[PDB]
């Protein structure tokens, strides 16, 4: 299911909480903002330095119908003065490379190997479909046969401003089989 060119970093591992020391009981979990067949996780108002920071903001994308476009917005470093100076997105090669769970850890996977037939176009609205442009997007196929769960990280917890720390953003995309 993989061709002769695609490689990932098999050494890479992280966790959902990262370095924040926040347990999963304490995550702020919420649903993605869904308009028609577009499901959106927008982190531009979730990750700025706050008094209680770092918190974990976990955006849940739950899919069980065909042709869902999933869109993830992660604020760019320097898009606001100071407030995202140390923000990091993982994987750097999102959405082509995603994170999946391997024995409590998060490791790299190819999204194309996870979901047969999905759309990952190189550009969306004449901009490269990569978090260096601030937003990624993929569209799920009419038929999914295999269940999958995968993750993206948009972490601002190392940004500090006036004795406040930013938050760590998590996207969890839950795809249940459909269209059989």
């Amino acid at each position, epitope marked *: 299911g993989v061709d002769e060119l695609d490689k990932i970093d098999l050494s890479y591992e992280t966790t959902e909480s990262g370095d924040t020391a926040v347990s999963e009981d304490s995550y702020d979990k919420y649903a993605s903002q869904n308009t028609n067949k577009e499901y959106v996780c927008d982190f531009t108002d979730q990750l700025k330095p706050t008094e209680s920071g770092p918190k974990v903001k976990k955006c849940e994308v739950k899919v069980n119908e065909p042709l869902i476009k999933v869109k993830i917005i992660c604020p760019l470093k320097g898009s606001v003065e100071k407030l995202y100076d140390n923000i990091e997105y993982v994987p750097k090669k999102s959405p*082509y490379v995603v994170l999946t769970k391997e024995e409590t850890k998060l490791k790299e996977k190819l999204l194309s190997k996870l979901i047969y037939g999905l*759309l990952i176009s190189p550009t969306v609205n004449e901009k490269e479909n990569n978090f260096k442009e601030g937003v990624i997007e993929f569209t799920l196929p009419p038929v999914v046969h295999k269940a999958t769960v995968f993750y993206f990280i948009c972490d601002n917890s190392k940004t500090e401003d006036d004795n406040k720390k930013g938050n760590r953003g998590i996207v969890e995309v839950y795809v249940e089989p459909y269209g059989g």
Partner: antibody
Amino acid sequence: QVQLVQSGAEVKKPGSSVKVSCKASGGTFNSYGISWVRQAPGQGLEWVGGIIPSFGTADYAQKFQGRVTFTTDTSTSTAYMEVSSLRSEDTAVYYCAGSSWSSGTYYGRSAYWGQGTLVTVSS
Amino acid sequence: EIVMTQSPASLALSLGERATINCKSSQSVLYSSNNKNYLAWYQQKPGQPPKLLIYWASTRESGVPDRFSGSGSGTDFTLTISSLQAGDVAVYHCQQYYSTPYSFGQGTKLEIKR
């Protein structure tokens, strides 16, 4: 042994409409991206548009806006291209091509080509 | 829209020589999230549809001999045919499939100089 077989050549009146069929043998095209590509006499290849039959979505070159419609009959695994308001300049061999899916695109490997359909626009 | 351009328009070389066909895109077709160039090469013999030779700029289709080689990255690409044979006479086309509208080069006609 996937094979694309197209409908026969025809002359069509200026201003009329033509519908070209393209039937896949060796199975369905439900995981394929279908492209339509034309070649005018003496010219290079020109992308007309494409459709992914699974997705029901179609793309068209700006030159063909409001004039070209792509459809599929998944029952018979046949793709159709309808070109209306035909102009003298539309005289060309029209090819359908199919590409299997890989790496997030339906158009990375257009290896299956129909034999071509010559549409002559003439009175 | 991405403009594709090939050079030379025509090539006449002797048997056994090396043919070099260049293709330039007006914008990069390299996607940084998978490091792939969205670039294909086709061979078209007279009376026949185009036949896919190279895809992802450098991957050979099944059955294509190793004398056919695609190279380049970003905006500049090259099809190289080593040790030219009499059956290689054809028009060669490059195509980008990076973004719609998909577009082709103008074609390069290759002939054998006896």
